[PDB]
């Protein structure tokens, strides 16, 4: 699968596995990022053992079962196959940097939206990605792939599987979700999308005219949730832990409204430790 | 005179149709306003607003007003998403509502007949149901709702009267009958009670 | 646990065209179904006017200079819009003339009163008062010269509102419409007064039939078909509109 000027490829072999190497030819310099590295993609082994319904076709079509390599929207390279989880590149500009992150988890997005069923029959098709914007074909059926009339390519947004089941069955059957964790989620989708967005923001420069302002809504968002977990924190009198979580803030106006929690959540003695991280800030 | 007799008091169905294709919904593109960093004419609209039609990107969902959804439909240039509502399995879950609930109108939107009347007929090739149960189940809850309105209609005193969760169209078409029944039970009890 | 909503609004706490055709709107629909003639939004049709001015005028200067990429869905969306503003806009006139029409004498005597506490530039517009004065006075020329020409002088009078019939039309004011509750104008409920909640939490306002002395609980988000006379005050503040 290749980008504009950039080329990504997967070699698998019985001898050395799944290695995959991002090429980029480019227009008049053929900079290489990555040649033959491991990659954590689980190939279907324990599934292909002779217990499937209606899979083992597809699984013929394509022995690995790998449904994707499309990139984003940003050049980061995506993978998609049996275990339903998108594979994404963080720091893939330096190769000591090299990072694969799981954006996304199909099965639990999908059964966090089912009602509570572990439904089955909602099967994935993505097609590309850009800024939690999945574009996928769920079809419903037993047949994973879909038909001559292409269905509308609904959009599935990322999350990381941070979701616990055990934390998640606390109401056991719009399935709820832990506001403890819920926040702490959206801390590190927030932490994630930041991190892709400066890499293309120096490097490649500016896309639509509104990175920077998706941008500063982003960390905006980011210390709101460190605000959130500074709060939750304080709600355990664990003052340490709050202390810990104030060190992250980015707005120092997040950090006058942490002040504010420390002052009002039953918490003097936060206050003045984070007074000293804001007047320590005052000449940072 | 200047408006004519069957416009009086009422709205025409056409008239209920302009104004819901005032309502915004949300479709996938098939072109690309958004200019990018490296001419071209906007919207710039006086009656709704301009910023989600100027930064289309294809297959990106936004949302725009209906009325300019159907327009860009006539072309194949997007592809309206059918609501949440518009789906089988909540067409099932207020069917078994009205089945289970004989007192009470279910939470239908107050535009359903009519949206589903015009994403029906203009973008039948977007829905994930077949089209051809997706009728089937509009058709049963309209026929569930009326058989609700006829045992209401039996209700129709002088001091008001309660029609909770009703639509617009079926509002629209009971007006005359209702607003009219009710003002001559009115003008009797004032008759009345002249006293 | 302790709720921190408060500090979260507090860190976010740093006329519009959409707006404008969205009270056009309103006001529209509350005039199709309201018995009386409601007063006239002079600022709102001001604006209203020039935004269609200023946009024909956009329209033509951008359609010369195509006349010399070929991008033409933003100006067939110009257009067809426009067409709609003014649709609803001659739809508004038209009804109110006719309502004028069903109340000329109605609106004639209220001009005529010293102790009306409205007058026709309050609730008129130029155009309408114009339209109103000339209809007046051909239908009572016409009447005049084909009726009452041949009628005695205790008889010749085109507002004899001391004969055996009232001769001068008034609104149905107990006229019933379909009301939905909308509930104060802006978004907060605790700020508006006449909101005394109901039980089951569900805020309600309260209104009360002089002819029956019966209280009803107008719940906020519900629909209602009510006399015209108890919802005036409420539909006069846009807590309801009309359906």
Redesign the interface.
């Known amino acids: 699968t290749a980008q504009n000027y950039r080329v990504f490829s997967v070699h698998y072999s019985q001898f050395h596995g799944l290695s995959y190497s991002l090429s980029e030819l480019g227009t008049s310099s053929k900079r290489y990022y990555k040649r033959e590295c491991p990659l954590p993609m689980s190939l279907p082994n324990i599934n292909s053992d002779m217990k499937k319904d209606a899979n083992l076709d597809y699984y013929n079509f394509n022995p690995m079962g790998i449904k994707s390599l499309f990139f984003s929207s940003y050049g980061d390279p995506c993978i998609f196959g049996s275990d339903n989880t998108l594979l994404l590149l963080s720091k893939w500009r330096s190769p000591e940097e090299s990072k694969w992150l799981p954006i996304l988890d199909s099965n639990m997005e999908i059964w966090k939206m089912s009602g509570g069923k572990e439904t089955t029959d909602i099967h994935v098709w993505p097609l590309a990605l850009a800024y939690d914007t999945l574009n996928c074909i769920l079809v419903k059926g037993k047949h994973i792939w879909p038909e001559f009339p292409l269905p509308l390519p609904s959009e599935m947004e990322i999350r990381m599987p941070v979701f616990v089941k055990s934390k998640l069955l606390e109401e056991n059957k719009e399935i709820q979700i832990p506001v403890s964790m819920a926040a702490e989620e959206e801390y590190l989708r927030s932490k994630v999308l930041s991190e892709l967005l400066t890499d293309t923001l120096e490097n490649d420069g500016e896309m639509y005219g509104n990175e920077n302002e998706v941008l500063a809504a982003l960390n905006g968002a980011y210390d709101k949730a460190l605000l959130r977990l500074f709060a939750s924190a304080c709600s355990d009198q664990n003052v340490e832990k709050a202390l810990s979580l104030a060190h992250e803030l980015k707005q120092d106006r997040a950090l006058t409204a942490a002040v504010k929690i420390s002052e009002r959540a039953e918490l003097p003695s936060l206050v003045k430790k984070i007074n000293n991280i804001r007047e320590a800030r005052y000449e940072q | 005179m200047s408006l004519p007799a069957h416009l009086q008091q009422t709205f025409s169905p056409e008239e209920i149709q302009f104004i819901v294709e005032n309502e915004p919904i949300k479709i996938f593109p098939r072109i690309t306003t958004r200019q990018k960093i490296r001419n071209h004419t906007r919207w710039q609209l006086i009656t709704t607003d301009d910023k989600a039609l100027n930064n289309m990107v294809a297959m990106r969902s936004t949302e725009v007003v209906l009325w300019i959804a159907l327009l860009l439909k006539q072309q194949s240039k997007c592809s309206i998403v059918a609501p949440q509502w518009l789906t089988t399995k909540e067409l099932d879950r207020k069917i078994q509502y009205e089945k289970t609930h004989p007192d009470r109108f279910s939470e239908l939107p107050w535009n359903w007949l009519v949206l589903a009347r015009i994403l029906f007929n203009k973008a039948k090739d977007d829905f994930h149901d077949p089209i051809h149960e997706l009728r089937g189940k509009i058709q049963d809850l309209r026929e569930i709702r009326q058989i609700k309105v006829l045992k209401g209609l039996k209700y129709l005193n002088e001091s008001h009267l309660q029609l909770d969760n009703l639509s617009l169209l079926e509002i629209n078409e009971l007006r005359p009958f209702i607003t009219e029944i009710m003002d001559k039970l009115r003008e009797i009890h004032t008759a009345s009670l002249t006293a | ?2 709720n ?1 909503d408060d ?2 609004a ?2 976010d706490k740093e006329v519009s ?2 707006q404008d ?1 969205s009270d056009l ?1 309103k006001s529209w ?1 509350n005039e ?2 309201s018995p009386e003639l409601l007063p006239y939004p002079h600022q709102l049709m001001k604006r209203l006017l020039n ?2 001015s200023m ?1 024909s005028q ?1 329209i033509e200067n ?1 359609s010369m200079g195509f006349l010399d ?1 070929e ?1 033409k ?6 257009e ?3 067409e ?2 003014k ?1 609803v806009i001659r ?1 508004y006139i ?2 109110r ?2 309502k004028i ?2 109340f000329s004498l109605y609106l004639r005597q209220l001009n005529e009163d010293e102790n009306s506490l409205i007058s026709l530039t309050d609730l008129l517009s130029k155009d309408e008062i114009k339209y109103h004065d000339t209809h007046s006075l051909i239908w009572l020329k016409l009447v005049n010269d084909s009726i009452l020409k041949y009628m005695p002088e205790e008889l010749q009078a085109i507002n004899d509102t001391e004969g055996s019939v009232n001769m001068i039309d008034e609104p ?1 004011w ?5 009301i939905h509750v909308n509930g104060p104008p802006d978004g907060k409920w605790n700020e508006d007064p006449l909101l005394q909640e109901n039980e089951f939490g569900k805020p309600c306002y309260t209104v009360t ?1 002089p ?2 002395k ?1 209280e ?1 609980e107008l719940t906020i988000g ?6 015209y006379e108890v919802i005036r005050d409420l539909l006069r503040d846009d807590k309801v509109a009309l ?1």
Do not use: A, G
């Open positions: 646990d302790i921190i500090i979260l507090e860190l065209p959409q055709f709107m629909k199709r179904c935004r269609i946009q956009l951008i990429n991008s869905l933003p100006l067939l969306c110009m067809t819009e426009l709609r503003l649709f739809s038209r009804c003339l006719s029409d069903k149905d107990n006229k019933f419409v379909f039939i002819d029956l019966e009803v519900s629909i209602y078909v009510m006399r359906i």
